[PDB]
Design a protein around this ligand. Structure first.
Ligand code: OLC
Ligand code: OLC
Ligand code: OLC
Ligand code: OLC
Ligand code: OLC
Ligand code: OLC
Ligand code: OLC
Ligand code: OLC
Ligand code: OLC
Ligand code: OLC
Ligand code: OLC
Ligand code: OLC
Ligand code: OLC
Ligand code: OLC
Ligand code: OLC
Ligand code: OLC
Ligand code: OLC
Ligand code: OLC
Ligand code: OLC
Ligand code: OLC
Ligand code: RET
Ligand code: RET
Ligand code: RET
Ligand code: PLM
Ligand code: PLM
Ligand code: PLM
Ligand code: CL
Ligand code: CL
Ligand code: CL
Ligand code: K
Ligand code: K
Ligand code: K
Lengths: 239, 239, 239
């Protein structure tokens, strides 16, 4: 029993994302034209994409019930699948990467390559959750998704940092890269521990809360820190 | 009664888009290599994406019947939903923005950010039309879509214009930006007045004609004006 | 009878793609930071996207049975449709184009325009295979797809080559462009000769083998040649 546990994890972020959007409009309204202003735009779009994700889940548009396959801890049982989360990450995670790439001033060759890997990660993660014929294919898609994640992590952890040191944004970039790497690693852990994976935690409402908490930090806190710094150091960024 | 009213609004643009494509091949065949030639390519792709959209609708591939929720003027009634229009805009509107960004010579940081917002606009607009559980979620998605539209409009209306003045294309860019802003504003008005929204107009054939007319100007006339100017001023653009 | 013929064409490439990935990690581990390293990343992602495609097909996630329309050689018969192939090309073909564009050092204006056309090609090809109301619309989508393909071919065949000569990569680019043009032309031929098109070949297992063979060369051999050359000429590429 937990329709309320599940629904509260969703409404709470519709409220938080909405508040973040207002706060960010306030914070960036006077930012100078150019690169600084572009990052402000990305910072606004991260919570807007997040609200779309939560509305898809609350409305029922992007949620369905799926039956787990033989071998799964819940084999032959119906599980609620919030596939709308996995689908929407294909738009919000590239926006986070866009914000970070604009900040580090990376060449779009690198930005395009990282967003491509990131989309591969999200598409294969969705496939992992939607696959029901055999347990093997669910984990095979999860593994491929991890492989795409490594490509993204390698870029944060290395190439992109090179670009930041040269744009005069190494310090803020180091803070945001570490926060991103740490929080992003939490999504596949939640997936593997919850109903979709090993089912060590069998509550979909609990797992939904785990993702909602990760979102608050990976998206809203992330974006506030980034936007506050850019507003306070706009000459460096336009430069 | 209006299978004919609806079907004619679709075939008419398959014919017009097809004619535009032939005219554009004729107009741009001799354009010099580089930036001018890239814009010619985008100008060809706008009507090609448009024809795909109309074929999805005419074939039935991207059309379904949906039932309106409690509170809607047509609550508990089946309505034809041309969701293929909303879906295909996710590919054609970025092409229009690409053509305008190549023209204004914007940095791809800005172009990527604007196309990202534009895709958010189109995806949330589709969600608005496909949502059926509650009337509230339909309008919530419509509002978020409007928010993404504002980000795109802000770019036309400001940042991009800066880039154009510096590329030597301010005049043609001012003409095309104004035409785009005006015509693009007509799509959410049609959506809100027609069956999907307030249903002040309850004919799906009429609303389909409203969109078809907007397409002729937003896509075909838009592209002809752009292509004619680039063919006539290719030195400025390659420069 | 041929569940085995069909399934072997899929498992064989899961194995080959997996081997390619290991070989490429080995080959590119020491490549210098920058452009060379980005191409290595794309070279890794081509086979990773390919494995996702084959897992979607083997699991049943991206396969369905469709009934052919009046006038088709198999009118009123159920045909297995591997639509997951067509869908996944929307991610793998842009990666191939990305690798080639990084190699030729093209401006992202051109790269974005070519990937846009390429996605149009893949989306309309999928529509061609998924359309079932009338035979006419299947071929109309196939023709539009061909039109988008011409835009991509024009870029390989011309604009991109200009960029390569200027990056010091003309020779390797000429080899890879020719291999790409030739192998890519084989996909629409297979589509038109097999069950989806004219049905001159009515075995879905045979047609699946035709695509699998094209994939080995268009993706794995392609990527090995590209990666071997970049590892051996990294100074030219970083330069
Ligand atoms: C500019 C951005 C503006 C963003 C928009 C504002 C966001 C408001 C969000 C949440 C309010 C809380 C709503 C909580 C509703 C809870 C409903 C419960 O209902 C339980 C059950 O269904 C009964 O029968
Ligand atoms: C952008 C600004 C967003 C601000 C957003 C508000 C911030 C959260 C605080 C208070 C509202 C909480 C509302 C909680 C409503 C609970 C309703 C319950 O439902 C009652 C009953 O079940 C029906 O049948
Ligand atoms: C959904 C239930 C209703 C929820 C409420 C509806 C949301 C919008 C409300 C208020 C405006 C927010 C203010 C945003 C900041 C305005 C601009 C300020 O600018 C100051 C500037 O920095 C000086 O120099
Ligand atoms: C650099 C990366 C190095 C990676 C190296 C990883 C090597 C594998 C290690 C441990 C596997 C432990 C497996 C334990 C399996 C227990 C059984 C399970 O299957 C149960 C199923 O329900 C049927 O009964
Ligand atoms: C560094 C070295 C790391 C080495 C790491 C090796 C990890 C294990 C690999 C593959 C397991 C394959 C398991 C296949 C189990 C088949 C079980 C049966 O079910 C099949 C299913 O029904 C089909 O549809
Ligand atoms: C450095 C780390 C790299 C990480 C790469 C991760 C790739 C994971 C692959 C396969 C997991 C297979 C799990 C198979 C579980 C089958 C049993 C089920 O049961 C669930 C639960 O344990 C019931 O209590
Ligand atoms: C830098 C820090 C490095 C940190 C590295 C951390 C590595 C953790 C790895 C694997 C956990 C695998 C968990 C598998 C749990 C399986 C549970 C099963 O349970 C079955 C049930 O309880 C009875 O049948
Ligand atoms: C290079 C680009 C070439 C582009 C391709 C050319 C486009 C031709 C378009 C429209 C012709 C008009 C077709 C009108 C068909 C109307 C059918 C009506 O039929 C009503 C009803 O179904 C009966 O029973
Ligand atoms: C790219 C070039 C595209 C050129 C495209 C042509 C331009 C439009 C003019 C005339 C054709 C109009 C055809 C109208 C056909 C009406 C047929 C009706 O259907 C008859 C009957 O219902 C069946 O059963
Ligand atoms: C669907 C029913 C049939 C519809 C008809 C099929 C469509 C193609 C027809 C004719 C070629 C169009 C001509 C396009 C222009 C050719 C090139 C010219 O080039 C002149 C150049 O400018 C000198 O310097
Ligand atoms: C900068 C932006 C500023 C934006 C400021 C906007 C403030 C809201 C204004 C007018 C609302 C008028 C509402 C009239 C509602 C009538 C009832 C409806 O609901 C009927 C439903 O069918 C149940 O009966
Ligand atoms: C500048 C300031 C602008 C301020 C603008 C404020 C605009 C109004 C906001 C929210 C309306 C929320 C309406 C909620 C109505 C709930 C009705 C019931 O239905 C719920 C539905 O079933 C659920 O699934
Ligand atoms: C500057 C302008 C910014 C514009 C931002 C727009 C956001 C629109 C949000 C909510 C509309 C809610 C409409 C609720 C209608 C419910 C009644 C239905 O009835 C339809 C028709 O009126 C029967 O005659
Ligand atoms: C720069 C120019 C600025 C121009 C600004 C234009 C603003 C228009 C705003 C809102 C229209 C809202 C229309 C809502 C219509 C509702 C109709 C209802 O009708 C119910 C029925 O007729 C009896 O029950
Ligand atoms: C780092 C990358 C690692 C990539 C991962 C390794 C890829 C292994 C692929 C294929 C092995 C061959 C599997 C062949 C299985 C054939 C099954 C047949 O089964 C027929 C029928 O269903 C019976 O009842
Ligand atoms: C990345 C490394 C990937 C390496 C991948 C291996 C390379 C291919 C060679 C040998 C394995 C072939 C396995 C063939 C298994 C055939 C099984 C059949 O199924 C048996 C029976 O039908 C069940 O019920
Ligand atoms: C699915 C069944 C199991 C399939 C097997 C699991 C896949 C991974 C296995 C082994 C490591 C591959 C080695 C990749 C290369 C390692 C790095 C080397 O680096 C040498 C360097 O070039 C010196 O200078
Ligand atoms: C630059 C491009 C130039 C392109 C120029 C292409 C002109 C068309 C050529 C040959 C058509 C041959 C058509 C043969 C049709 C046979 C009948 C078919 O329809 C059978 C159907 O099953 C009902 O019975
Ligand atoms: C260089 C010049 C090249 C010129 C090339 C011209 C190629 C032929 C064009 C169009 C065929 C249109 C065929 C329409 C056949 C309708 C048959 C009936 O079926 C209709 C279907 O049911 C509807 O849904
Ligand atoms: C330079 C080349 C450019 C190529 C552009 C290609 C556009 C293809 C368009 C239409 C094909 C229509 C085919 C209609 C087939 C109907 C009959 C079926 O039968 C299949 C088979 O022949 C039974 O034996
Ligand atoms: C705003 C949301 C964010 C930052 C979401 C990030 C999500 C991921 C990094 C998901 C990663 C996953 C894997 C690496 C394995 C497959 C399971 C996933 C999709 C949860
Ligand atoms: C070629 C077609 C074009 C130019 C289509 C443009 C469509 C829009 C600007 C749609 C905008 C909408 C909103 C801003 C609110 C939600 C309803 C939409 C999707 C119609
Ligand atoms: C890795 C896979 C590759 C390189 C796939 C390439 C696929 C194409 C070039 C498909 C082309 C097609 C057309 C041009 C007409 C419609 C049928 C298609 C989609 C097979
Ligand atoms: C920043 C550029 C990213 C480009 C990403 C291209 C693919 C986007 C796909 C997004 C699917 C999102 C659908 C969301 C539906 C919902 O949120 O309710
Ligand atoms: C210019 C680059 C844009 C990138 C856009 C990425 C997401 C494209 C999604 C397009 C969906 C279109 C499906 C069309 C089907 C039809 O037209 O019948
Ligand atoms: C290199 C950038 C490309 C951008 C492409 C944007 C649109 C990608 C859509 C990919 C759909 C792939 C779904 C795959 C599912 C599967 O493989 O099982
Ligand atoms: Cl999201
Ligand atoms: Cl369109
Ligand atoms: Cl693929
Ligand atoms: K649902
Ligand atoms: K339909
Ligand atoms: K299936």
């Amino acid at each position: 029993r937990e329709n309320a546990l599940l629904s509260s994890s969703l409404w709470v972020n519709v409220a938080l994302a909405g508040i973040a959007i207002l706060v960010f409009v306030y914070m960036g309204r006077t930012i100078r034209p150019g690169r600084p202003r572009l990052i402000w735009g990305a910072t606004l779009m991260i919570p807007l994409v997040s609200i779309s994700s939560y509305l898809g889940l609350l409305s029922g548009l992007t949620v369905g019930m799926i039956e787990m396959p033989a071998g799964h801890a819940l084999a032959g049982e119906m599980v609620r699948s919030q596939w709308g989360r996995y689908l929407t990450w294909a738009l919000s995670t590239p926006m986070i990467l866009l914000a970070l790439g604009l900040l580090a001033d990376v060449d779009l060759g690198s930005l395009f390559t990282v967003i491509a890997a990131d989309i591969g990660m999200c598409v294969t993660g969705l496939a992992a959750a939607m696959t029901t014929s055999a347990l093997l294919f669910r984990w095979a898609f999860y593994a491929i998704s991890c492989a795409f994640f490594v490509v993204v992590l390698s870029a944060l952890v290395t190439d992109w940092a090179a670009s930041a040191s040269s744009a005069g944004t190494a310090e803020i970039f180091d803070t945001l890269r570490v926060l991103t790497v740490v929080l992003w690693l939490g999504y596949p852990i939640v997936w593997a521990v919850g109903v979709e994976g090993l089912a060590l935690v069998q509550s979909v409402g609990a797992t939904s809360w785990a993702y909602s908490v990760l979102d608050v930090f990976a998206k809203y806190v992330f974006a506030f820190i980034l936007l506050r710094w850019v507003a306070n150091n706009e000459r460096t960024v336009a430069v």
